[PDB]
């Protein structure tokens, strides 16, 4: 499911992000909410509508961030397990037709396209619990069986 281990880089990033959220964004949000409450106090105020929606969204995001920061645990393995793409290495797999991926095993929270695109959620990566330099990682993808010959694994 959702592996409670995440990258230490992701942990630091999300911590700084929640700090900035509860420290900067929430203040201006509350200020805009009050300014809308200034003589508006009605169901027609688009400003008040946007403010309340953003308030609910900020609340949800803050709850989720706090939960991920406390309950979960960070994991950033060093290159001691180099070559081993089990953890802590931007590993790459080539294909016979051009499906060449190059990513690192990151949690199901800090999923973006700034460092990699991988996640421990899909079985297409779950079969990769510990990879190597020639692993023929094959799976039944959502629209047919796909495969990739592991072509590179290293950390940074």
């Amino acid at each position: 499911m959702k592996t409670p281990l995440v990258t230490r880089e992701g942990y630091e990033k999300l911590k700084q992000e929640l700090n900035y959220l509860w420290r900067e964004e929430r203040p201006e949000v509350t200020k805009k909410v009050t300014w809308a409450a200034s003589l508006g106090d009605r169901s027609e105020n688009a400003d008040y509508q946007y403010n309340k929606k953003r308030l609910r969204e900020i609340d949800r995001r803050v709850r989720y961030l706090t939960k991920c920061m406390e309950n979960l645990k960070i994991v950033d393995y060093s290159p001691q397990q180099e070559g081993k793409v089990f953890f802590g290495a931007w590993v790459e797999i080539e294909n016979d037709d051009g499906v060449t991926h190059r990513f690192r095993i990151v949690g199901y929270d800090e999923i973006f396209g700034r460092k990699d695109y991988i996640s421990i959620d899909s079985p297409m990566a779950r079969a990769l619990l510990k990879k190597e330099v020639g692993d023929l990682a094959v799976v039944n993808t959502p629209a047919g069986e796909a495969s990739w010959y592991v072509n590179a694994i290293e950390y940074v």
């Binding site: 509860w22 420290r23 929430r26 509350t30 706090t66 920061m69 406390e70």
Partner: protein, 50 residues
């Protein structure tokens, strides 16, 4: 009370304690993270009311 079904007609005491516990736990998780004062105030207030 196990009702006849996949539900439970919970006693109010259960739900109350439940609310209190969620509240206390959020408060705990906040203080160690030095979250800002307005938030911690709202927190403590909800707690007292709970």
């Amino acid at each position: 009370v196990p009702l006849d079904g996949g539900r439970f007609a919970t006693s109010d005491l259960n739900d109350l304690y439940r609310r209190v516990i969620n509240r206390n736990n959020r408060l705990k998780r906040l203080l160690d993270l030095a979250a800002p004062d307005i938030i911690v105030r709202n927190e403590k207030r909800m707690l007292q009311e709970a």
